[PDB]
Ligand binder design. Structure first.
Ligand SMILES: CC(=O)N[C@H]1[C@H](O[C@H]2[C@@H](O)[C@H](O)[C@@H](CO)O[C@@H]2O)O[C@H](CO)[C@@H](O)[C@@H]1O
Ligand SMILES: [Ca+2]
Ligand SMILES: [Ca+2]
Length: 129
């Protein structure tokens, strides 16, 4: 039906917001909430393909994190871990600990320090049709 709030993009019964501007993961979380969505949750290769094609080449935050329990990733939509697109070797919990997930410019996922500033962040919301 291709029906979304203004500035959002429709794909398979969800609307997506391709946010831009440097944000830490928590700032991106609340930026999405301010727009009445959440950082994006990804549950199929077709959805990943939609995002990969449109992703910010400098990287972008998504709605996946292991902040609560290390190695237990949780989606913003709280749905199961039924699809992954990890960059090879990721998540690697590098450095002091990497608990927030980004898409690299390629769309592949990397865990990163939650306080890194990325210039992209993607929100989603349920579409009305
Ligand atoms: C290559 C890459 O993923 N670069 C991003 C960087 O990633 C960290 C770390 O998380 C990766 O596991 C290793 C893989 O070699 O590389 C870097 O050390 O995280 C940054 C955010 O903190 C991103 O801006 C980079 O794109
Ligand atoms: Ca971690
Ligand atoms: Ca990593």
């Amino acid at each position: 039906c291709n029906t979304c709030p203004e500035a959002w993009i429709y794909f398979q019964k969800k609307c997506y917001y391709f946010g831009e501007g440097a944000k830490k993961w928590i700032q991106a979380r609340y930026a999405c909430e301010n727009l009445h969505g959440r950082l994006v949750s990804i549950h199929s290769p077709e959805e990943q393909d939609f995002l990969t094609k449109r992703a910010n080449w400098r990287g972008s935050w998504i709605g996946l994190r292991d902040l609560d329990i290390e190695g237990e990733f949780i989606w913003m939509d709280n749905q199961p871990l039924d699809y992954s697109n990890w960059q090879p070797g990721e998540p690697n919990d590098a450095g002091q600990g990497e608990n927030c997930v980004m898409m690299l410019g390629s769309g592949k996922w990397n865990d990163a320090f939650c306080g890194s500033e990325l210039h992209g962040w993607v929100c989603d919301r349920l579409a009305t049709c």
